[PDB]
C-alpha cells in the first residue's frame, strides 16, 4: 500500500492541478514535518515552493491593487474611502504575515537543518530571504528594518554557499542573484547595487555558457533574460 508520504505528494499534485494552493501547502507541510534525517526530493521541495509562491502571490497581487487605489484616493483627500481601503489592506497584510510565518517557521525548524547538499541549502536560504522580503514590502519603520535585516542576512548566507558551491549557470544561483538584486532595488532603494549584482551574475553565467555550456539550459535561459529585463528597466529609468 502507498505510504502516507506518497499519498500526500500525490494529493499535492492534484491540488496543484485544481489550483487549490492553500491545500497544496498543507499536503507538502505534512510531508516536510514527517521527515527524519532525510530531506525532501527535488520534486517535493519544488512542490512546496510552488504552493507557497502561489498562496503568497495572490495576496501580494491583491495588496498591490489595493495600494494603488489607496494612493489614488489619497491624492483627492477622500478620507472615508481611504479608511475603508486601509481596513481592507490591513486584512490582506494579516494574511501575508501568517503565510510568511508558516514557511519561515518550517524553514528553520525542518528544511534548513535537513539540507545536505549545496543545492538544497542555497534553495532554502534563498526562500528564507524571499519570504522576509515579502514582509519588508509592506512594513515601515522599525518592523521594516527588521525584515530588511533578515532578508539581507539570509541572502548573504545563500550567496556565500552559491558562489563557492554551484555553477554560475545554475538556476538556483541565478534565481538568488535575481532576487537579491531586486531586494537592493525595491527594499533598499539602491539601484546602484541592484545593477552591479545583477550584472555580475549575468556576466559570470555568460562566461560559463561561452566556455563550458550548462546542463539545464532552459531554466538558466529564462532567468538570465529576467536579469536582463531588470537591468534594461533599471538603467533606462536612471538616465530618465
Amino acid at each position: 500500500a502507498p505510504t502516507a508520504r506518497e499519498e500526500n505528494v500525490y494529493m499535492a499534485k492534484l491540488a496543484e492541478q485544481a489550483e487549490r494552493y492553500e491545500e497544496m501547502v498543507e499536503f507538502m507541510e505534512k510531508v516536510s514535518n514527517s521527515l527524519g534525517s532525510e530531506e525532501l526530493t527535488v520534486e517535493e521541495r519544488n512542490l512546496l515552493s510552488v504552493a507557497y509562491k502561489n498562496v503568497i502571490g495572490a495576496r501580494r497581487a491583491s495588496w498591490r491593487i489595493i495600494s494603488s487605489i489607496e494612493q489614488k484616493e489619497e491624492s483627492r483627500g477622500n478620507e472615508e474611502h481611504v479608511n475603508s481601503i486601509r481596513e481592507y489592506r490591513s486584512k490582506i497584510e494579516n494574511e501575508l504575515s501568517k503565510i510568511c510565518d508558516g514557511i519561515l517557521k518550517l524553514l528553520d525548524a525542518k528544511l534548513i537543518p535537513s539540507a545536505a547538499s549545496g543545492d538544497s541549502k542555497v534553495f532554502y536560504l534563498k526562500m528564507k530571504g524571499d519570504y522576509h522580503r515579502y514582509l519588508a514590502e509592506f512594513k515601515t519603520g522599525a518592523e521594516r528594518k527588521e525584515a530588511a535585516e533578515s532578508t539581507l542576512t539570509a541572502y548573504k548566507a545563500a550567496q556565500d554557499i552559491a558562489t563557492t558551491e554551484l555553477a554560475p549557470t545554475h538556476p538556483i544561483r541565478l534565481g538568488l542573484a535575481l532576487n537579491f538584486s531586486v531586494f537592493y532595488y525595491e527594499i533598499l532603494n539602491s539601484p546602484d547595487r541592484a545593477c552591479n549584482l545583477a550584472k555580475q551574475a549575468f556576466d559570470e553565467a555568460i562566461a560559463e555558457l561561452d566556455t563550458l555550456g550548462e546542463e539545464s539550459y532552459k531554466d538558466s535561459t529564462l532567468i538570465m533574460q529576467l536579469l536582463r529585463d531588470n537591468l534594461t528597466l533599471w538603467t533606462s529609468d536612471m538616465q530618465d
Binding site: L178, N179, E186, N230, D237
Partner: peptide, 7 residues
Amino acid sequence: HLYFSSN
C-alpha cells in the same frame, strides 16, 4: 517605477 521581475 516599481514592480520588476523576480524568481
